[PDB]
Paper text:
Here we report a functional and structural genomics effort that applied saturation-level transposon mutagenesis and next generation sequencing (Tn-seq) to identify essential genes in B. thailandensis, followed by high-throughput structure determination. We used an “ortholog rescue” approach to maximize structural coverage of these gene families, which are likely to be essential not only in B. thailandensis, but also in related, but more virulent, Burkholderia species, such as B. pseudomallei.
Ortholog structures may also be useful in designing broad-spectrum antibiotics with cross-species activity, and by representing a variety of functionally conservative point mutations in the active site may be useful in developing drugs less susceptible to mutations that cause drug resistance.
Author numbering: 4 to 151, 159 to 210, 227 to 311
């Protein structure tokens, strides 16, 4: 790909979210890789510059290296769509739905994409009542995940429901999957990237058979695509003790630091950092 085909590129980085510092780190490295590949790239921090400057300064496309908040929830995607600026990763629906664990899991359940069973808790519920019904119906341990804390005993759940409804009007109480591990499949166009095991480090080889890895990647890519997400991201999943997968969530704005997942997945099969960034930007052509 001739670098001049990309035109003038903005690397979106920084922003106003809690994850600002990680985004600066991603962005600085994406910018450098693009510039090393000959691409006319420039940083653009939307916490500090007005979004209209993109059109006014002739930027034709953006590599989005923002994390969290408006960088990942469809807001900046919508605003860029409106200004005619192409960008990496998922459009408005994919991004909005991808950050919404509740609706992601409803879509999955209805389309047969396996995902851990769960109950919803809503700001204003009888917290003490629900806890009782939820532990009875689902078991322990549970995870309390605000839609947009691990709980191991029944009487600890109320306090966690009270606390988690402070962060979202909708709280997903999810059954924990035991005995298999946590994994992630990085998605970057048609690049064939290996499954990574996540140890709460990132572990390659993930320790599954090549056949299992191959079928889980197809399934992962489907879990991602059915939400409207396209081109670039991750799908996280648990395996139970027999190797049955359960998808947890997707990520539509993955880290691009030197210690982030996709660079580690890429390097493991001989794809350099620079090649990864160029290929992900290439999808916007």
């Amino acid at each position: 790909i001739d670098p001049k085909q990309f035109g003038k590129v903005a690397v979106l980085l920084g922003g106003n979210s809690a994850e600002r510092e990680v985004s600066l780190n991603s962005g600085r490295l994406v910018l450098q890789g693009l510039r090393d590949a000959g691409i006319d790239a420039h940083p653009f921090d939307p916490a500090e510059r007005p979004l209209a400057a993109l059109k006014e300064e002739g930027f034709v496309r953006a590599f989005n290296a923002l994390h969290g908040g408006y960088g990942e929830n469809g807001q900046i995607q919508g605003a860029l769509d409106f200004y005619g600026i192409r960008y990496t990763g998922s459009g408005v629906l994919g991004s909005a739905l991808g950050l919404d664990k509740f609706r992601t899991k409803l879509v999955w359940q209805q389309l047969g994409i396996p995902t851990p069973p769960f109950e919803a808790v809503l700001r204003g519920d009888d917290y003490e009542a629900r806890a009782k019904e939820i532990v009875a119906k689902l078991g322990l341990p549970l995870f309390v995940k605000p839609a947009s804390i691990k709980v191991k005993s029944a009487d600890a759940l109320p306090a966690a429901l009270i606390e988690a409804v402070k962060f979202d009007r909708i709280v997903v109480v999810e059954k924990s999957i035991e005995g298999g591990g946590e994994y992630t499949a990085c998605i970057a166009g048609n690049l064939d990237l290996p499954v990574i095991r996540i140890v709460p480090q990132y572990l390659i080889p993930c320790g599954l058979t090549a056949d299992e890895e191959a079928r889980l990647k197809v399934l992962a890519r489907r879990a991602f695509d059915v939400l409207g997400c396209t081109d670039w991201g991750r799908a996280d999943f648990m395996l139970d003790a027999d190797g049955n997968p359960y998808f947890l969530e997707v990520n539509t704005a993955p880290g691009m630091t030197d210690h982030s997942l996709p660079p580690k997945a890429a390097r493991a099969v001989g794809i350099s950092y620079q090649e990864l960034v160029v290929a992900v930007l290439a999808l916007t052509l």
